[PDB]
Design a protein around this nucleic acid. Structure first.
Ligand SMILES: [Ca+2]
Length: 615
DNA sequence: TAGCCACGCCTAGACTCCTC
DNA sequence: GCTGAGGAGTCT
DNA sequence: AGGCGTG
């Protein structure tokens, strides 16, 4: 009796956004009418819409449309949708390119034939270039070809870009708390539902929390429109970079750079600057900064470094947008000056200024530090004394390295085919530890999540919960998450540091039994084979260790979430555990990884780097 | 397989778009 | 260079 | 596109 998965999920999106009064302010009357028109359709008509909303947006032959779970004949349904003005028909098919596109290459031959001026053979593309030229000079004749092609192509439909645009913008908002926002969704096909979401949104159950918002992200329907535009730009840039179309990317960026400079002074930006960090990331300003970042990324690739340094300096001079990224920026500026512009004076100024900055953390901070000690203790440099300058000697403690071997066939080994990580697990089984988990960061994350679930989804912090389908409070990756909860956390961290290893085992089974299945961003329910396995692990890890890890994950999830060892292995009976970063022959330790390793040792834990050698 | 040409048929592999 | 696996239909 | 037979 239920709806198909795709419709359910689509409906969940609309519901969610529709019930925000703050968000409904950003749609005009005409627009809201289109939503209502949708709900006014038959289950069948809704089913067909979502189907094609998901598809790539373009003309579709009627003979290539077939969904039997919808209707054995689709003409009634199609009409309904055209009447509603959601779809359109060959009647409205006007553009020549569009018609030639819609044709099969065989049919494009027939048409190249019965039109004499055309040379019958070549590629679909070649023929389309032929036709599209011909018509641009002798347009009257173009009309005749258009006429005939349409006939030859037959009956056809296409989703209406007017109504569609509204559903995009709704989806965009749903995504500011979700599926573009749990890290950038490259929503191609013009703006759609991500696959994971399209499949499970309808069935997903979410944590219990209390929505309390007391600020507007957007000024008005124009602001949002300006934003959504920045978003589509940023995407296309990334998209370009991703397809190695670096030349096109440069344009798009420089183009967008102007756009951002034109906007300076607009009233809307004053309220933006004043927004707290965890919300400020949802503004044009932020996205344009994010764009500028990729821009230096692009410049660097085209080996245009003086330029790249300029931009880096811009970014670093303001403190309004993306402060988390300053670590990265400094580091990158440092490198570029030193390495590619070979310019030592500023490099030293750069390093010192960066290290001064409270915004730089973990990995990048260390990477800076090292460049300094490399620099101070270099001959062709020693003509100074300015990096002796009371550099608080941030040493990192060294850790037990180890080496094993496996015959190599991402690298794939044999023992049965396997990965580097599975190969190492084998070693540690025969080394006495009958248990092990390849979870990297997730393992530690889902413990921290089972151990602080209620403090996470705790009430009393303004603005972090905003609507129906969240999986985390919005402040989770900000300095403010800990600060906005210092009392309750300082408490719980203490209480874990002291707990007996039964308190732990119990604590876990509460959360597990209460929440098992609820979507939360830190917790992965199938990460552990059972609740039982989850309990063993915390027993071996124990209080002081767990508590210590949790402190960093609460204090700075932004800069800590990454760099945990690939493995946790433990022996069932001895209760001794081991934390293992598995390194192939062809990679090393990253700064983020070593900071962690030192840190886990100070907490007193069996930490080990395990290299693999191939044959 | 003598060596070269002329012509057209068939299909493997790449690619796009779609599905859950 | 990867962050999904797989199928079907089409082009050359 | 490009391998293959056949004329
Ligand atoms: Ca590894």
């Amino acid at each position: 009796t239920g709806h198909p998965y795709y419709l359910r999920s689509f409906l969940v999106v609309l519901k969610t956004v529709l019930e925000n009064e703050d968000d409904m302010l950003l749609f005009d009357e005409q627009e809201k009418g289109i939503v209502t028109k949708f709900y006014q359709l038959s289950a069948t008509g809704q089913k067909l819409y979502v189907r094609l909303f998901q598809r790539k947006l373009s003309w579709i032959k009627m003979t290539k449309l077939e969904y039997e779970e919808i209707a054995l004949d689709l003409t009634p349904v199609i009409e309904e949708l055209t009447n509603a003005g959601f779809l359109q028909t060959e009647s409205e098919l006007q553009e020549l390119s569009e018609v030639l596109e819609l044709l099969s290459a065989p049919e494009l031959k027939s048409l190249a034939k019965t039109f004499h001026l055309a040379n019958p053979n070549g590629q679909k593309q070649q023929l389309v270039d032929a036709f599209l030229k011909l018509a641009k000079q002798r347009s009257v004749i173009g009309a005749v070809i258009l006429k005939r092609a349409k006939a030859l192509a037959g009956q056809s439909v296409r989703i209406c870009k007017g109504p569609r645009a509204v559903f995009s913008r709704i989806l965009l908002l749903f995504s500011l708390t979700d599926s573009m926002e749990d890290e950038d969704a490259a929503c191609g096909g013009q703006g759609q539902l991500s696959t994971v979401l399209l499949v499970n949104l309808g069935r997903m159950e979410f944590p219990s929390y209390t929505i309390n918002r007391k600020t507007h992200i957007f000024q008005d329907r124009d602001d949002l429109i300006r934003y959504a535009a920045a978003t589509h730009m940023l995407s296309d840039i990334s998209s370009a970079m991703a397809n190695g179309n670096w030349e096109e990317a440069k344009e798009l960026a420089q183009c967008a750079k102007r756009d951002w400079n034109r906007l300076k002074n607009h009233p809307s930006l004053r309220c933006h600057e004043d927004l707290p960090l965890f919300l400020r990331c949802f503004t044009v300003g932020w996205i344009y900064t994010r764009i500028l970042s990729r821009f230096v990324e692009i410049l660097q690739r085209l080996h245009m470094y003086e330029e790249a340094v300029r931009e880096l300096e811009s970014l670093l001079s303001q403190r309004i947008y993306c402060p988390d990224s300053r670590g990265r920026w400094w580091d990158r500026l440092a490198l570029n000056l030193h390495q590619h512009l070979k310019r030592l004076e500023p490099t030293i100024k750069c390093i010192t200024e960066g290290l001064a900055d409270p915004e730089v953390r973990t990995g990048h901070r260390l990477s800076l530090y090292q460049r300094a000690v490399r620099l101070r203790e270099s001959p062709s440099c020693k003509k100074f004394k300015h990096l002796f300058q009371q550099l608080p000697e941030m040493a990192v403690q060294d850790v037990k390295h180890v080496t094993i071997t496996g015959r190599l066939c991402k690298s794939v080994f044999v023992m049965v085919l396997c990965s580097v990580e599975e190969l190492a697990l084998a070693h540690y089984r025969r080394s006495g530890f009958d248990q092990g988990i390849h979870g990297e960061g997730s393992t530690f994350s889902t413990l921290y999540g089972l151990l602080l679930w209620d403090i996470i989804f705790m009430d009393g912090i303004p603005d972090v919960f905003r609507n129906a389908c969240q999986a985390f409070p919005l402040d989770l990756c900000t300095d403010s998450f800990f600060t906005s909860r210092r009392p309750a956390l300082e408490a719980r961290l203490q209480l874990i540091h002291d707990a007996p290893e039964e308190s732990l085992r119990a604590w876990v089974a509460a959360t597990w039994h209460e929440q098992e299945g609820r979507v939360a961003s830190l917790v992965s329910w199938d990460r552990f084979t059972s609740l039982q396995q989850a309990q063993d692990l915390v027993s071996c890890l124990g209080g002081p260790v767990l508590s210590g890890v949790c402190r960093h994950l609460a204090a700075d999830f932004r800069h800590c979430r990454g760099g945990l060892p690939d493995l946790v292995v433990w022996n069932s009976q001895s209760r001794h555990f081991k934390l293992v970063e598995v390194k192939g022959p062809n990679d090393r330790l990253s700064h983020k990884q070593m900071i962690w390793l030192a840190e886990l040792q100070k907490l007193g834990a069996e930490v080990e780097v395990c290299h693999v050698v191939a044959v």
